[PDB]
Amino acid sequence: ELSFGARAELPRIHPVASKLLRLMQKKETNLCLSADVSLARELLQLADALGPSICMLKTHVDILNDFTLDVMKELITLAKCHEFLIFEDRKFADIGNTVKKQYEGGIFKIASWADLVNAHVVPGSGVVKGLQEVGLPLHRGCLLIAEMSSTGSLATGDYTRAAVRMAEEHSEFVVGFISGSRVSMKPEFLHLTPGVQLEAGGDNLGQQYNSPQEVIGKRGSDIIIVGRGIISAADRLEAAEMYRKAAWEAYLSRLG
Amino acid sequence: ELSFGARAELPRIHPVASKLLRLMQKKETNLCLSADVSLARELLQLADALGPSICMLKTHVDILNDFTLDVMKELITLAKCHEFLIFEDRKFADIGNTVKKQYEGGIFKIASWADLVNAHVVPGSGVVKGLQEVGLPLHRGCLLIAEMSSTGSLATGDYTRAAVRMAEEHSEFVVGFISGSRVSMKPEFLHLTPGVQLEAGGDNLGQQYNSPQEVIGKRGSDIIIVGRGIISAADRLEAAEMYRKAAWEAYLSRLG
Numbered sequence: 001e002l003s004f005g006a007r008a009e010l011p012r013i014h015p016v017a018s019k020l021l022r023l024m025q026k027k028e029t030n031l032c033l034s035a036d037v038s039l040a041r042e043l044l045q046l047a048d049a050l051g052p053s054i055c056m057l058k059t060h061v062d063i064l065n066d067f068t069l070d071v072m073k074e075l076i077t078l079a080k081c082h083e084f085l086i087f088e089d090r091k092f093a094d095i096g097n098t099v100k101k102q103y104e105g106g107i108f109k110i111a112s113w114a115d116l117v118n119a120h121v122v123p124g125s126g127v128v129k130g131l132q133e134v135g136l137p138l139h140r141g142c143l144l145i146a147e148m149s150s151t152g153s154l155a156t157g158d159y160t161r162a163a164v165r166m167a168e169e170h171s172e173f174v175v176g177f178i179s180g181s182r183v184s185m186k187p188e189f190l191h192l193t194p195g196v197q198l199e200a201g202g203d204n205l206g207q208q209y210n211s212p213q214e215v216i217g218k219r220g221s222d223i224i225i226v227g228r229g230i231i232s233a234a235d236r237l238e239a240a241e242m243y244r245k246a247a248w249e250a251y252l253s254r255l256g
Numbered sequence: 257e258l259s260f261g262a263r264a265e266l267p268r269i270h271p272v273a274s275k276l277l278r279l280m281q282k283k284e285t286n287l288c289l290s291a292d293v294s295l296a297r298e299l300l301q302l303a304d305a306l307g308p309s310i311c312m313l314k315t316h317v318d319i320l321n322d323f324t325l326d327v328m329k330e331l332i333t334l335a336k337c338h339e340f341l342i343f344e345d346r347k348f349a350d351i352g353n354t355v356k357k358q359y360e361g362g363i364f365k366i367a368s369w370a371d372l373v374n375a376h377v378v379p380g381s382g383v384v385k386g387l388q389e390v391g392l393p394l395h396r397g398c399l400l401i402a403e404m405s406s407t408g409s410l411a412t413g414d415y416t417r418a419a420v421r422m423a424e425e426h427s428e429f430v431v432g433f434i435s436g437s438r439v440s441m442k443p444e445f446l447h448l449t450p451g452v453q454l455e456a457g458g459d460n461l462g463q464q465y466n467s468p469q470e471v472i473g474k475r476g477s478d479i480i481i482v483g484r485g486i487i488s489a490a491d492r493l494e495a496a497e498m499y500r501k502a503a504w505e506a507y508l509s510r511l512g
């Protein structure tokens with residue numbers, strides 16, 4: 001198994017993946033903050049304070065009450081300053097012709113500011129084809145949702161295998177997965193795992209949690225995605241540090 | 257088989273479904289216009305001119321370049337005047353906690369103006385639970401995506417059966433399906449079918465077309481969803497009439 005820094009140099013690495021892997025090793029972080037807030041001011045204060053601790057900030061632009069493109073200008077400034085990628089967790093899941101417009105246009109202009117987006121594989125490979133027609137020219141990357149954290153997920157068995165095949169057949173654009181585990185044996189592909197908290201539990205609406213040690217160390221994923229475990233804590237900086245240290249040591253101990 | 261008007265009176269009918277079925281029979285239309293445009297003025301001019309011909313107007317609010325809530329105020333005026341429902345084709349597909357915010361909040365406030373939304377079933381039933389916590393109090397309905405029109409769709413076999421079960425277990429909120437065919441044997445559930453054109457063909461990004469006669473008459477669906485077959489035509493009113501008459505006669509001939 002190669003280090004993040006060595007993976008960043010793999011022949012077939014995507015440029016977005018390489019940038020990410022380099023800053024993960026430089027900063028000793030494999031934590032993605034899920035900035036699940038409705039106020040721009042809170043999003044930006046979290047991005048600034050937690051920026052040094054994270055490799056990535058995941059957004060849901062469609063829950064921000066006071067979205068403007070200028071908010072995203074301010075977010076990019078912070079991402080550049082603190083060195084993290086922006087991942088819009090849009091979960092594109094329509095026909096190719098529709099998702100291209102959803103990605104490029106409308107109010108959000110997601111492709112203009114998001115390094116990464118993700119997509120469901122259920123519509124077939126046209127979802128990726130449509131996105132890639134916007135995202136390739138804009139030097140973006142995409143993650144495919146191969147497994148989900150929620151109770152009753154149907155992203156298992158042959159579905160997960162189809163996501164892996166689709167990623168591998170569109171490596172020009174697809175840089176990895178949302179998954180609960182390592183699903184691809186090719187080290188050029190990132191594995192990002194949500195449903196992460198230090199303590200056992202879940203929410204009232206089907207979320208299920210596993211620890212950083214479980215998903216990075218035992219299940220072989222690369223990056224933890226953490227929302228409420230950080231966001232709901234009083235001191236979100238120390239919470240982010242706890243999660244960072246957990247995920248980083250789990251990664252180190254798997255490299256041996 | 258019962259008429260749309262009789263289905264509107266079924267004991268277990270949802271109020272949104274009943275409203276829809278009543279206006280379908282009153283107006284002799286089972287056509288849903290897919291208003292896949294980027295300008296508010298065009299959306300509203302289409303809604304006004306085509307309103308008499310349609311039972312429903314399907315939106316992708318996230319491709320509208322000049323979205324405001326006032327545009328949607330103007331759309332509701334037209335929907336009330338001409339008697340059609342508004343369906344936001346958002347394809348919610350996240351954990352329950354996330355989709356509740358995506359449905360109620362952000363810039364779009366979808367639940368405030370959309371009679372209907374839809375969801376993928378891949379995350380498990382928490383997606384429906386989350387939506388229903390916003391949509392039940394707001395007297396809304398939801399469609400579950402049981403089959404898709406696109407090449408390579410994984411919404412087949414056990415996946416489609418899971419969508420049907422999920423709908424049937426959440427009949428307080430779920431009023432039907434996006435599907436290619438009748439998938440539920442319970443007449444209280446609407447079947448809406450996209451991927452419809454009069455002529456054979458497809459697009460460059462995995463869309464596949466079948467005719468109104470095929471999907472309403474042979475496959476037993478209720479409503480056709482038509483975008484480019486109308487939107488790209490020169491005379492969109494006559495195109496809508498062609499599709500309306502096709503879908504309506506196919507429905508009549510299946511009732512015998």
Ligand SMILES: O=C(O)c1cc(=O)[nH]c(=O)n1[C@@H]1O[C@H](COP(=O)(O)O)[C@@H](O)[C@H]1O
Pocket residue numbers: 034036058060089118147148149150178194195196207225226227228229350351354
């Ligand atoms: O794509 C995601 O990030 C995602 C996929 C998945 O399987 N599960 C999942 O929880 N997520 C997202 O990751 C975040 C989890 O947040 P918490 O449960 O608060 O840690 C939310 O923003 C979800 O939308």
Ligand SMILES: O=C(O)c1cc(=O)[nH]c(=O)n1[C@@H]1O[C@H](COP(=O)(O)O)[C@@H](O)[C@H]1O
Pocket residue numbers: 094095098290292314316345374403404405406434450451452463481482483484485
């Ligand atoms: O949910 C939908 O309406 C949908 C589901 C599906 O399986 N296929 C499908 O095409 N759609 C949508 O229906 C419309 C089809 O448009 P046309 O291909 O232009 O008729 C688009 O807005 C798609 O996003």
